[PDB]
Paper text:
Influenza virus hemagglutinin (HA) is the major surface antigen of the virion and the primary target of virus neutralizing antibodies (Abs). HA is a homotrimeric surface glycoprotein, with each monomer consisting of two disulfide-linked subunits (HA1, HA2), resulting from the proteolytic cleavage products of a single HA precursor protein. The head of HA mediates receptor binding while the membrane-anchored stem is the main part of membrane fusion machinery. One of the most conservative HA stem regions is a 55 amino acid (aa) long alpha helix (LAH) which is currently under intensive investigation as a potential universal influenza virus antigen.
The stem peptide encoding HA amino acids 403–474 was the longest fragment (Mw = 8.5 kDa) which was efficiently produced in a soluble form and was selected for downstream applications as HA tri-stalk protein. Our tri-stalk protein is significantly shorter and corresponds to HA2 amino acids 59–130. The crystal structure of HA tri-stalk protein was solved to 1.7 Å resolution using molecular replacement technique. The space group was P63 and the HA tri-stalk protein was found to be located on the crystallographic 3-fold axis. Therefore, the crystallographic asymmetric unit contained one protein molecule. The first 3 N-terminal and 3 C-terminal residues were not included in the final model due to poor electron density. The structure revealed that HA tri-stalk is an elongated trimer with the length of approximately 63 Å. Each monomer consists of a long α-helix at the N-terminus, shorter antiparallel α-helix at the C-terminus, and a small flexible loop region on the surface of the protein connecting both helices. The central long α-helices form a tripartite coiled coil with the short α-helices packing along them and forming a 6-helix bundle-like structure. The protein clearly matched the structure of the corresponding stem fragment of the native HA at its low pH-induced post-fusion conformation.
Author numbering:
A (entry chain A), B (entry chain A), C (entry chain A): 6 to 70
Write the structure that this text describes.
């Protein structure tokens, strides 16, 4: 019977809410990383055709899904 | 009686400690983002008066509370 | 008897899996921060000998363990 109890559901929903907080926080971080990168690449600071620069685009792309 | 039991409190405190780890980790990340940004803006790399650059300051400000 | 029950172990393993997700996510973020920084420092954008620039290397080093 524990999975219908109040206490099990309290803890479960706290886990779920933390997992959501982590997902939304990671999305916020990686959206920031994307917004910064594209500005930095607008300069001669970072060149889009350098393979090390493409590595960053590819990570950001993959993180934003 | 479960909320006074040892097991419920063990799990609850693990949740709490994870939530703290997430908060402190996000604060570390966003403090880093702030420290990097202000250095990058010291250059002509990023211009503080560009509206896309202000977007980044505003996100960092909001994240650091 | 609760620590051998199914429900306690279900919640515990969810905590553990979330903690792993957080660790792996933070490592991904800080690896990205390292990869970006070293590219930015390749330019006159950021000078490795400036003490504020060394602060960033030191944080990244410490985060990657």
């Amino acid at each position: 019977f524990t999975a219908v109890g109040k206490e099990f559901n309290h803890l479960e929903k706290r886990i779920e809410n933390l997992n959501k907080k982590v997902d939304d926080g990671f999305l916020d971080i990686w959206t920031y990383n994307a917004e910064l990168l594209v500005l930095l690449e607008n300069e001669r600071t970072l060149d889009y055709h350098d393979s090390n620069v493409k590595n960053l685009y590819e990570k950001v792309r993959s993180q934003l899904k």
